[PDB]
């Protein structure tokens, strides 16, 4: 169905740095992109839903935006705790799909 391409495959950034991770959809997914944070040993946590809305309890350092076919996850003021794989989820159609997962390492 609609495939998701996530890039970079991995990031490395220092504490206090700002980084971005992007999602590219093969089709128009009209503001139906969700972002998830997966820490080792845990089920993925929802960070951002409907392209730019933060889930309750998500730190203010996380934000994002986008439009048809292109979305960005921005993480400012990276802390040692923000170590995770980040995933792109496309909720637009029924056979829901995910991107590959970006691995972000904190220094």
């Amino acid at each position: 169905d609609i495939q998701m391409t996530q890039s970079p495959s991995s990031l490395s950034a220092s504490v206090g740095d700002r980084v971005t991770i992007t999602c590219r959809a093969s089709h128009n997914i009209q503001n139906f992109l969700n972002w998830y944070q997966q820490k080792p040993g845990k089920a993925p946590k929802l960070l951002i839903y409907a392209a730019s809305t933060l889930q309750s309890g998500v730190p203010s350092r996380f934000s994002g935006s986008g439009s048809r076919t292109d979305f960005t996850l921005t993480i400012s003021s990276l802390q040692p705790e923000d170590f995770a794989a980040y995933y792109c989820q496309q909720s637009y159609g029924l056979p829901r799909t995910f991107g590959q997962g970006t691995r972000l390492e904190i220094k």
Partner: protein, 126 residues
């Protein structure tokens, strides 16, 4: 408040049937009007969506599993279950159940997964 818990056999032999059960707690499975999902992670690989069931029996699946998968729920126990036939090495994964919520939006309900269970590992081996 909402928690999802999972259990299963742990070990499945090749060509046997894999069967997992998710128990929903703090969220009536039959009243919320929400969709219940199964997702898994194979070693190395990222998240793969398996399928979902509505609060009623309407069920959808990832087409790659169309010859092998069945999903059902028992309202009486607030439980979801996943069944995969002809299980092989490729099916080793951490399985997770999750709840699908929504935001009313300009394009229709905008769905997301807020509550996830802890998941469980199923190993397929001889």
């Amino acid at each position: 408040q909402v928690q999802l818990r999972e259990s299963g056999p742990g070990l499945v032999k090749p060509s046997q049937t894999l069967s997992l059960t998710c128990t929903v707690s703090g969220d009536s499975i039959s009243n919320g009007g929400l969709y219940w999902n199964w997702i898994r992670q194979r070693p190395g690989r990222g998240l793969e969506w398996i399928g979902y069931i509505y609060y009623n029996g309407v069920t959808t699946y990832n087409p790659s599993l169309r010859s092998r998968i069945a999903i059902s729920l028992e309202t009486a126990k607030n439980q979801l279950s996943l069944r995969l036939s002809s299980v092989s090495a490729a099916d080793t994964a951490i399985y997770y159940c999750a709840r699908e919520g929504w935001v009313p939006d300009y394009g229709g309900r905008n769905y997301y997964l807020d509550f996830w269970g802890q998941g469980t590992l199923v190993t397929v081996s001889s």
